[PDB]
Structure 1
């Protein structure tokens, strides 16, 4: 025990587990950060049910969460209204050179990520972390992204002072002692989180929800294999395995190592004949992945099974199959809109062992939100997400627009049998899409891999409530990755294009969808949800080589009568499927200006070529 005093030994403060049990480098990480942050206690998480019960009890007793008595082991957290979603403007990546992280925009102000210099980050770090956990417990969370012990899994350690983060990580990752045993003396991603409210409190606590909005900063240091997040408890900012690791850090590793880390669901779809295919889909935040990934198809005999709803790690095997795995262990899903009619499999999943954040509570201990589509007995009352009595005729919603459920994937009734298979599932189609109220038809198919990459690059979508963006501003969200690129977007495009030069590659067919086109009065032209199975059927047939497509300037679309619209006789097909020369001339000009300004010297030639080819096809209309 080599030391002149007690070294950096924090053993006296350990209230679960043992520092002696930890791999050497894990111990160093814990003790170095204990020295810095000065927690009152250290809790080494074991991931056991016993621990989870006591953690929930502790939070309940502290008033941080409430038990929802109507359900089996479900809980409700209500946050400070300042800490409710991601904050892109406070999310940064540190590298030696800015251009490695983001292209330099011609006009000023990049929209493909925020870079911070090493020097500026050190100052930011020193202004936040020293002493930040005083009076609190530092929890040590050993977690695996991907199935335990898989050669493709990646392990992290997250230190946090938030028991809400511990509970949510238990759901969203594989966590506990088994992860430490699989880790051994291997490398792990170093993840440090604090709510940034050391005791005694310097500022008023709102709704018993510790946070520091003024100093909120979600930082990524890929060259140090570190993620450092301060001031926010909201899951996208605090669950460091999810967006921070499994997209931002992992996307750059993937570029270096020949794979892909993407904001994509993975689903398996089986037709009435029993033939099954796996598909991946990238839609922006709050644009429909969870609803698609566990859809109940309206077409009789069709079945969808869920591999993952949010993040995909994909790599070509030796046979050329693009194999995908879900690195998550749960769903962190948008609550509003979820009903028996729109997402019955989510309703089944969230009946037990689920943590809800910022939803409303009924007087009989249930959950409520806009679009839940379940009448309450007369006399039953509602407490809004703001902890105030609420009525249906009220101006503001009962649930926050970005309220979430956090639920075990193992509870999904149609979880796919291969959802934890270490080798992944073979992807036969990749689907892009987002919210476009005008101009973009229900579905089209890219003409080639290069055209498909351009389609991903050109994605635009109405702003949602998943981050700080207000109104329904149509924003660029290439590959649904705008908030999540771990490195220069132009390099990411080159990396995707390079997949076509892999010998033997079985390149997935690429499609683009729009569930959200609206008529003149602002009403949806397409009902969506389970009806989207009709679009998946067409995709399935196209992968099988069916002659069910008509060429248009934007790509292939369904032939007349090719889509099954039985039961949707009132859909206005000409409006929904319409392609206007005027709209598309404007669209290509907008994309050209965006790529030139935002990507410029980093833009691959093949992307510029696809833009010109699209413009040329439009000119022949």
Structure 2
């Protein structure tokens, strides 16, 4: 009801009808419309016609440019201050800090950023009132996971950015059919604004609306709400991806008995006609998408991609660990992608793809560092900074975190079960990161508990996907450090508890290192498609082949167990060397980290594995 005409926003709806929305969805839209004061409300239907009009609008506004060389591909250039996920402005709100992070012994927590409800209310009120003035509020109904899948969850994202709408159409399942499936069910509430109400007080760089000073990405798991302000970019604005499908979801998974993880899912078929699925957790910028889409060098082997970034997993009644990819597309790092490093991505991205912050060629194409493809005479390059660019300039032509956004169904090796609602059965889990020294090419964990310790102990040299820079070795347990939705100690206990489940078929756990360097700073391992030789060894180990040798850190391939035919120049002694001096220091760093950062919430089984590793190294 109303005493005037200030609460009913029906007169501002330019697509759809508030009356057709489920009651709780309507309240969420209208209540936030009252707060944010949009000029128009657009309820997305997911149709091709809608997508075409939004592209045309963004093109008319100068937000995107058409890449005339390809089929329906587009380029967006951002403000250089809004180029990546920002870990330091990402917070989780719970009544008690211990629900979100373990209370550290001495230092500041690196495992999350907690904010009190009272502090968030002040931050919220300083940002959102009136923030969409003069803009359209888009209502995005989306499903994470195939519609109707038992592990599928529905969200509603409100946003004032058409770029977010177009990207969410690719990255999620979006539109009218989701609203019909939702009915009066529960949904995750996602609220986003670029934070630039009109009239603009500050001019825009590259026609990219953002508010870097006020950027804040908040999660309220108890209210099932995600609230993001000030950034239009990737993990900050596509709220289904990191905010929902890892942070909120990992908390729900803890409550409901499943897992939500930063893992690719791949299926690999051997020359005997046997197929197995594996999941792999590597940190951002550490090669998940390259592995998920790999073109194997070994003849008679095939790799198919289920997903490249997020996995939701649950034991079924039979004890199989089943996984789904909740995403609908790939949001992949562009630089370094070439016919030699990821040819299956090259095939995927040549139609229906949105590129952000890569270079444009004068004939309507895309360019980036590492594309490894020469240009014809006379073709010139415009950098992501909208400037003429020559290879003689110092700066790269594409931002290091520039991305492609592409439909998963276009991938030529997309797995036939990638949308199956029952998920695929996982028989191995791979961990790994960038370790230039000390850590061998591959090893296998000694037990479930040791494998959980291996995940907990993950470290990786700093890349350029967050705001971290330089060559520092940082901790990134389970590749989830930016993404834990709750107390990491309780997350470890959750993982350990899977061994207590009746008839659970626990997968084998492996750790890889593609990145070991020699004294010259040269990679010892060619990687990319050649990583199929490591997968072959894992496949045989899952089948029970006697192809491993025991070391203090776990099982490693026997001499001649790895197919190295075609790379006779491979230094196997350096690739698999285990130095007592390196590992004595490694265990001390892991010990100091777990003691400070996990403290009273460290499960005893993890401390026991640490003690056992220390003892095995001491006996070397």
TM-score, normalised to structure 1's length? 0.99
Residue in structure 1 matched with residue 467 of structure 2 by the alignment: 468
Report the CA distance between 1:393 and its aligned residue: 2.2
User: SS at the partner of 1:323?
Assistant: strand
Deviation at 1:32, TM superposition (A): 0.2
Give SS of 2:150's match.
Answer: coil
Aligned residues: 620
Tell me which residue corresponds to 2:366.
367
Q: How far apart are the structure 2 equivalents of 1:537 and 1:8? A: 62
Shift of 1:120: 0.2
Once the two structures are superposed, what CA deviation does each residue of 1:143-192 show, in whole Å capped at 9, x if it has no partner?
Answer: 00000122321000000000000000000000000000000111100000
Deviations along 1:87-107, whole A, 9 cap, x unmatched? 100000000000110012222
Offset at 1:392? Answer: 1.3
Secondary structure of the structure 2 residue equivalent to 1:33: helix
1:78 aligns with 2:94: no
String of CA shifts for 1:517-571, please: whole Å, max 9, x gaps: 1111211111111100000000000000000001000000000011011111111
RMSD, matched Cα: 0.7
Q: CA separation in 1, counterparts of 2:8 and 2:298?
A: 62
Q: 1:8: how far off?
A: 2.0
Whether the 8 Å CA contact 2:112–2:482 is kept in 1: the answer is yes
Separation in 1, partners of 2:402, 2:524: 26
Verify the 8 A CA contact 2:151 2:312 in the aligned structure 1.
no
Give 3-state SS (helix, strand or coil) of 2:235's partner.
helix
Q: Return the alpha-carbon distance in structure 1 between the equivalents of residues 590 and 150 of structure 2.
A: 40
Residue 325 (1) aligns with residue 333 (2): no
Deviations 1:467-510 (A, max 9, x none): 11011221100000000000000000000000000010000000
Structure 2: unaligned runs, 5 residues or longer: none
2-side partners of 1:235 and 1:500: how far apart? 36
Cα deviation, residue 204, structure 1: 1.9
Separation in structure 1 between the aligned mates of residue 175 and residue 385 of structure 2, nearest angstrom: 33
CA–CA separation in structure 2 for the residues paired with 1:587 and 1:171: 42
1:523 and 1:204 map into 2 onto residues whose CA distance is: 46
Instruction: Report the CA distance between 1:462 and its aligned residue.
Output: 1.1
Which residue does 1:566 correspond to in 2? Answer: 565
Shift, 1:74, TM fit: 0.2
Q: How far, CA to CA, are the matches of 2:494 and 2:309 in structure 1?
A: 21
What pairs with 1:587-606 in structure 2 (closer than 5 Å)?
Answer: 587-606=586-605
Q: How far does the alpha carbon of each residue in 1:35-91 deviate from its partner, in whole angstroms, 9 at most, with x for none? A: 000001000000000000000000000000000000000000000000000110000
Alpha-carbon distance, 1:3 to partner: 2.8
What SS class does the counterpart of residue 428 from structure 1 fall into?
strand
Cα offset, 1:336, TM superposition: 0.6
Deviation at 1:6, TM superposition (A): 2.9
Cα offset for 1:5?
2.2
Which sits farther off after the overlay, 153-162 or 387-396? 387-396
C-alpha offsets along residues 355-395 of structure 1, whole Å, 9 cap, x if unaligned?
00000011101000011010001221111111111111221
| Per-residue CA distance 1:293-336 (angstroms, 9 max, x = gap) | 11000101100000110000000001000000000000000001
Q: Which residue of 1 aligns with 2:609?
A: 610
**Within 2, Cα distance between the matches of 1:557 and 1:151?**
38
- C-alpha separation in 2, matches of 1:440 and 1:263: 22
1:205 counterpart SS class: coil
Which stretches of structure 1, 4 residues or more, deviate above 4 A after TM superposition? none
- TM-superposed deviation, 1:466: 1.1
Shift of the alpha carbon at 1:465?
1.4
Deviation at 1:580, TM superposition (A): 0.5
CA distance in 1, matches of 2:558, 2:619: 20
- Does 2:585 correspond to 1:556? no
CA drift at 1:7: 5.7
